[PDB]
Every structure is written in structure tokens, then in C-alpha cells.
Ligand binder design. Sequence first.
Ligand SMILES: Nc1ncnc2c1ncn2[C@@H]1O[C@H](CSCC[C@H](N)C(=O)O)[C@@H](O)[C@H]1O
Length: 202
Amino acid sequence: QKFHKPLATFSFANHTIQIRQDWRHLGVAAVVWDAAIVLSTYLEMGAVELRGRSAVELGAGTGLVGIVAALLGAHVTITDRKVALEFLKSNVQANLPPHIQTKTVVKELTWGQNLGSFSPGEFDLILGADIIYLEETFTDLLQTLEHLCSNHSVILLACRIRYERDNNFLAMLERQFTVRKVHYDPEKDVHIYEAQKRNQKE
Ligand SMILES: Nc1ncnc2c1ncn2[C@@H]1O[C@H](CSCC[C@H](N)C(=O)O)[C@@H](O)[C@H]1O
């Protein structure tokens, strides 16, 4: 029902964020999911180092998490697939001051595709809010995390565990990475997992 609203408004990092929404004509990438609100709240509370830190957001959708992380001092590469790009670029540009904008990159990253255009030790922080849902690209997503996550890098995945497939991806993630519960929101039923490369000796 919140999805039907043409505009979703939030207060994060001493700023009013006005997200344009389009559930009807664009769908999933054009609405703010609860996991993006929960992850953005967690980033604000202080357990994560953000100031001057290199960050990438995967499947940003509207871009809330990436916007909040940028406003909190990170150098964020806010990404999604080609079809979501235009709408993502519009919410980012209209919600960031120009001094934050120069430290922000809005570009495409389709999971497991053109991974070579990204440096394996480029990002210290990897973000994803409610991006676990499409079984057909689970391998694509794991190959992206494995390509981007250096030994120092931390992954923060905010999830709504809906079906068996969700636990399956988390088991796939656990094979190569340490996966630890760092936050749980009962009313929104969202868990934030932190992931790190397990065998750092390679
Ligand atoms: N193969 C793929 N490559 C990149 N992004 C993908 C993808 N498959 C799905 N996504 C993206 O994953 C997102 C799930 S919607 C979640 C949007 C946002 N983080 C929020 O929580 O509000 C969508 O934006 C969708 O475009």
C-alpha cells in the first residue's frame, strides 16, 4: 500500500530524502523496500565506518541506502541493472548536494556481467538491501560478491527471508564467506547479515 504512493519521504543524516516511486509502471526497482529503511537506519547508528570509505551498492533500486551512505561520508558507486538505471539516476541526483554528488558514481552493474570493469580491491564496503529473490541469478550475485569483496572489505546484506530459496542463497554465501547476524528488526521482519571472505590466505 506504501508502494502506491508517488513519493516516499525520509529523514536520514540531517537530510530530507524524497524518493519518486513507480510501482504501477516500473515495479520492484521503483519502490523503497523495508530492508532499505532498516539498512539506512543501521548505517546511521554508528557500528559501520563510512567517512571517506569506498562503497558500492548492489541492486540500489531507488537508491535510498546509497543516498544515505553518501550523505554519511562514503564514496559510493550506486548500482543496478540497465532497465533500473534511469530511475535510480533521477532519485540520486535530486537528493544529494553538489559536494556529495562529486564523490558519488551512478553506473550499471548487472550481476556477474562485465565484472572486469571493476577492481577486486576497489570497495571497502559492499551494500545490498532486499536483493535476494531471483534464484536464476543467485550464481551471478555470488560471483559479483566474490569478485568485489577483498580481504579487508565487509558486505552488509539486509534481507527479508520469505521462502526456502532465501536460506539457499545464504548457504551458498556461507561456503566462501563468514555470514553473521548483526541486526534484526521485528516489526519489518528484516535481518542484516555481515559477510567477510573466510579464507583470507586464498
Ligand atoms: N541481475 C541483476 N543485476 C543487478 N540488479 C538486479 C538484478 N536482478 C535484480 N536486481 C535489482 O535488485 C533490486 C531488488 S528491489 C530492492 C531495491 C532497494 N535496495 C530497496 O531495498 O528498496 C531491484 O532494483 C532490481 O533491479
